Amino acid sequence: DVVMTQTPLTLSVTIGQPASISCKSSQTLFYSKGKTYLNWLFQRPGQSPKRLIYLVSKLDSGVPDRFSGSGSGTDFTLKISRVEAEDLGVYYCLQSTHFPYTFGGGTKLEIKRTVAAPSVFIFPPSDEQLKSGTASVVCLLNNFYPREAKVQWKVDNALQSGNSQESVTEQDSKDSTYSLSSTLTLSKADYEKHKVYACEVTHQGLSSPVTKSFNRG
């Protein structure tokens, strides 16, 4: 099968800068005179891919002219003249000259921006959940950059370990930030044993760690 070698795997670019993605095939994608079936696709997280470029260099309708495709034979290039915030996502090359059709491994375009500290919020378990016998305590870190962040849970000032899980959003298409949720899970029994619930957040945009906390009740 035709192997499509797509580079770089990740492209980190500041808004306004140009960007270039390369696709090399293991054999020529020339089909016949003037017909070389190389497509470029784009996919946002949790959504379907869309086509941006077909036949090496032809722009699909509904695609900004900042995008361009070039190349021939085994060597192809997608260029973005000036990256905008909404361009983040994964780009794929796709050859259709030879069966089986084959795809590059993808390039994830990430936006570089200035540091942004998280806004931190803590949520106690609801009474409804408590009746059920379990307590979920949630810590939200909202709209921060870069993605790296440390969340530390403390119960009655004791540091917790192995009873929390985190989730992080994909980079936002307008403001280029991330958000993060950390969930501490306790039995109802353990939750009622303790009084002070706190999450402590460390992040490059904070001059010192921030703690949000509540007292059960």
Partner 1 sequence: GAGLADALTAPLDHKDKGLQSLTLDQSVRKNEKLKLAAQGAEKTYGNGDSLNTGKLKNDKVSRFDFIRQIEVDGQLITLESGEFQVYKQSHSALTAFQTEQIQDSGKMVAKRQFRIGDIAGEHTSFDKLPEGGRATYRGTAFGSDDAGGKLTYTIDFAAKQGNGKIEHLKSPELNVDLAAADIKPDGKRHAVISGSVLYNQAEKGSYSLGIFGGKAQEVAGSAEVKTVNGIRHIGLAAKQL
Partner 2 sequence: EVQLQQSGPVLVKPGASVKMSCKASGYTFTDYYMNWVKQSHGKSLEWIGRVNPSNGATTYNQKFKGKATVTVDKSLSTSYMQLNSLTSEDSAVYFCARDWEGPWFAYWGQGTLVTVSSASTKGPSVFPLAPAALGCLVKDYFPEPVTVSWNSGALTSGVHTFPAVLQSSGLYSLSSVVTVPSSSLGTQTYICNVNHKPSNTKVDKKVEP
Q: Where along the sequence are the contacts to partner 2 (CB under 8 A)?
A: 37, 39, 41, 48-51, 54-55, 58, 60-61, 92, 94, 96, 99-106, 119, 121, 123-126, 128-129, 132, 136, 138, 140, 142, 165-169, 179, 181, 183, 185
Alpha-carbon separation of residue 72 from 8, 27, 37, 75, 206 (angstroms): 19, 11, 10, 6, 49
**Judged by CB under 8 A, which stretch of 8-16, 27-35, 45-53, 101-109 contacts partner 1?**
27-35
Alpha-carbon separation of residue 217 from 127, 192, 197 (angstroms): 10, 10, 11
- With beta carbons less than 8 A apart as the criterion, state whether 91 and 79 touch: no
> Which SS3 state, helix, strand or coil, does residue 19 take?
strand
140 or 186, CB closer to partner 2?
A: 140
18 or 45, CB closer to partner 2?
A: 45
156 or 175, CB closer to partner 2?
A: 175
Distance CA 217, CA 215 (A): 6
The strand pair at 107-112 and 10-14 is best described as parallel
The strand pair at 164-168 and 196-202 is best described as unpaired
- With beta carbons less than 8 A apart as the criterion, state whether 139 and 158 touch: no
Does the protein bind partner 1 through residue 35 (CB under 8 A)?
yes
124 or 146, CB closer to partner 2?
A: 124
**String marking each residue 40-79 x if it binds partner 1 according to CB under 8 A:** ----------------------------------------
Instruction: Please identify which residue in 31, 101, 103, 123 interacts with partner 1, judged by CB under 8 A.
Output: 31
Binding residues for partner 1 (CB under 8 A):
31-32, 35, 37
